[PDB]
Design a protein around this ligand. Sequence first.
Ligand code: CTP
Ligand code: CTP
Ligand code: MG
Ligand code: MG
Lengths: 241, 241
Amino acid sequence: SKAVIVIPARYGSSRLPGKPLLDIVGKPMIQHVYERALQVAGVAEVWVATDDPRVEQAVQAFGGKAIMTRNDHESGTDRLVEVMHKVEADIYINLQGDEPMIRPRDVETLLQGMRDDPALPVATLCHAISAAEAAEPSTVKVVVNTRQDALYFSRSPIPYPRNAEKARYLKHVGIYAYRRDVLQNYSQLPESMPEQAESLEQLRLMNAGINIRTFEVAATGPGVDTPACLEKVRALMAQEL
Amino acid sequence: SKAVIVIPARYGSSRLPGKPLLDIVGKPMIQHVYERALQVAGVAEVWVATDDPRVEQAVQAFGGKAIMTRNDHESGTDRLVEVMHKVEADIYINLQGDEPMIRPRDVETLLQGMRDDPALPVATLCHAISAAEAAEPSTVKVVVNTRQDALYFSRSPIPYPRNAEKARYLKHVGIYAYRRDVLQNYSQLPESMPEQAESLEQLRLMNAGINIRTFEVAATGPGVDTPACLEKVRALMAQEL
Ligand SMILES: Nc1ccn([C@@H]2O[C@H](COP(=O)(O)OP(=O)(O)OP(=O)(O)O)[C@@H](O)[C@H]2O)c(=O)n1
Ligand SMILES: Nc1ccn([C@@H]2O[C@H](COP(=O)(O)OP(=O)(O)OP(=O)(O)O)[C@@H](O)[C@H]2O)c(=O)n1
Ligand SMILES: [Mg+2]
Ligand SMILES: [Mg+2]
């Protein structure tokens, strides 16, 4: 059971452009992710999937695996599919490039889930959040059953707060562990109505009966989209040491 | 493949005491439901599960079948399990006692779904609704996959309208079709957190990985909850004549 990590790092960014080559305390964001990916046990390879060369050059610079990919992809998942075709593996882990504060142990937990249950198509992460945090649509909630299998993913605060005291929310940490086969019969997947309405690509798998299991971890640090928190990333990154 | 129809009709009601016996165009509400259930093809038995002797009598009064049950039942569902033990069948259909405007064909569509797939645990119904309606916490929304399997049931507008033009909604028509086995292991099922927050008992099935398939129908007539709705249906059913 070989497993590899893939890190999508497009240059073009609607919000903050060239977001991956951004300097977070001496290193380019993308590098922080790479180094951390390298610390994950059980992984045979760590690849960065890029579309622009200013990234590929940046990556090779620190000696990272730089595989060039199409500059047309509408989503990460797609770009990952293209890499699944050239880099052989049983398990693919997709780590976003805008999260320089990922926890190598969280990833290990994710990959362990895949290993503990071979029949599991996809694994992903989540963590508890206040009902105050579950209000913001930028935040994505997830609800699961006893087996931790995902029921649904939404921008709406689910479950609804009827008996509000009994409500418990879980943010969804956008990392995924895919079974090679899943990626292979993926391009054939048609976009679902919930997907397009919600603007959540993972719902394209649920539309197709493809089970996704969630794994809970501790409140994770901030991602990197808002240059405002970007100071907290640097401040937390810089402090972290 | 024997299938029976169960109609829970407890005497009690926070706003319409005796409700099952309320008069709509000449007959007590419960009768309407019964007569309509009797029109459904493929059903071997139509039973009314009650908790009161006055409710029992009335049903015997017009030639219907009745069965007394624990007056301490907490829910129409838990009342059904008790009937599952006395009346043998492979499929159980639970029709509400406060919905005299049920459509015999909708139930047939429901029973057919269970028959077309022996492996299906439970089947239910739904129907399209505007986003303006879906806003009401009072209305239970449901979202499904390509095979029409339910992903989640909530009072929150799901799917969330990120790209509203893509958001299409379904109101959950609360009728059920239970495979005998499902009812046999029901009392062992523990209440789920999502079920408690949203106050939706069907969510105790999903928490247990027990698939529920939804079938779409045309917008259904209203039930009898408050006396405004009572006069609301009374009218409808009279102008139908
Ligand atoms: N076609 C795409 C889309 C996304 N990504 C990658 O997926 C991660 C996060 O995606 P996202 O949050 O959507 O960032 P952007 O794609 O740049 O869009 P935005 O800035 O608005 O969030 C990043 O590593 C990004 O480069 C990618 O490689 N190729
Ligand atoms: N302990 C119970 C609870 C409910 N039911 C039956 O389940 C159906 C619908 O129940 P519900 O949706 O909960 O409506 P009500 O409970 O009657 O709402 P209210 O208390 O406000 O009248 C009705 O046929 C009702 O008689 C039952 O037989 N026994
Ligand atoms: Mg991002
Ligand atoms: Mg009612």
